Amino acid sequence: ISSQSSKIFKNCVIYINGYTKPGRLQLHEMIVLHGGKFLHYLSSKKTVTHIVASNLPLKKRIEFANYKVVSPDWIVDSVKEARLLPWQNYSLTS
């Protein structure tokens, strides 16, 4: 009835900020195909759980302490492994 397989981003809404390789469109597609959800843009309010940056500045790590900011490699590599990865390894929020 329901595959529910490679559900790496199933409970995860992901926003992308800055210039990330590969493109924000591509990373967001990698999220969706893995049963995941995404966000276009935030305006201070907590309507996301994960953010993707190329690099994330220190005062913005404080700005986004509430949101698990990571490198695009979390999304790219998890999809290539078809498994959940430690986002704390790829963390740009800390």
Curated annotation (Swiss-Prot):
Effect on the protein of changing G36R: Loss of activity
Occurrences of domain BRCT (ranges): 4-92
Compartments (UniProt record): Nucleus; Mitochondrion
Coiled coil: none
Function statement: Deoxycytidyl transferase involved in DNA repair. Transfers a dCMP residue from dCTP to the 3'-end of a DNA primer in a template-dependent reaction. May assist in the first step in the bypass of abasic lesions by the insertion of a nucleotide opposite the lesion. Required for normal induction of mutations by physical and chemical agents. Involved in mitochondrial DNA mutagenesis.
Family, per entry: Belongs to the DNA polymerase type-Y family.
Assembly behavior: Interacts with REV7.
Note: Present with 521 molecules/cell in log phase SD medium.
UniProt name for this protein: DNA repair protein REV1
Species for this entry: Saccharomyces cerevisiae (strain ATCC 204508 / S288c) (Baker's yeast)
Gene this protein is translated from: REV1
Part of the full-length chain shown: 158 to 251 of 985
